Design a protein around this ligand. Structure first.
Ligand SMILES: [Cl-]
Ligand code: NA
Length: 129
């Protein structure tokens, strides 16, 4: 599913991401836009053989099992395919684990290079929340 900007903001807010660990909703919507262009089915292979899955491009090296990433961890205890669902619950719950890892949202390269330090509030502007 390809989410609308405000539709995704509403979904994330309902799942408790707004201000989660101090990150305002705008940060999550901005990260999703640049990581997957709001597409839940987005996948991207990395040089190390791992793959990123879903709306928030969660990596198979540490967070989910895709059966083809040797010596990897499944910290979120979920098949990576579950992160491609139209229902973002799995992605949100796993993201909460990741952001509490100690490095915050810096774990998402796109957020660090394209959202961090910007007016992220603009991403939820005009939305009925
Ligand atoms: Cl933090
Ligand atoms: Na894994």
């Amino acid at each position: 599913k390809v989410f609308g900007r405000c539709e995704l903001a509403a979904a994330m807010k309902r799942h408790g991401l707004d201000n989660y660990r101090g990150y305002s909703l705008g940060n999550w919507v901005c990260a999703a836009k640049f990581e997957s262009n709001f597409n839940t089915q987005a996948t991207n292979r990395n040089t190390d053989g791992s793959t990123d899955y879903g709306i928030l491009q969660i990596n198979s090296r540490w967070w989910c099992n895709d059966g083809r990433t040797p010596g990897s961890r499944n910290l979120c205890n979920i098949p990576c395919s579950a992160l491609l669902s139209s229902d973002i619950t799995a992605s949100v719950n796993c993201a909460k684990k990741i952001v509490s890892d100690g490095n915050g949202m810096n774990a998402w390269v796109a957020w660090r290079n394209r959202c961090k330090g910007t007016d992220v509030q603009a991403w939820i502007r005009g939305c009925r929340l």
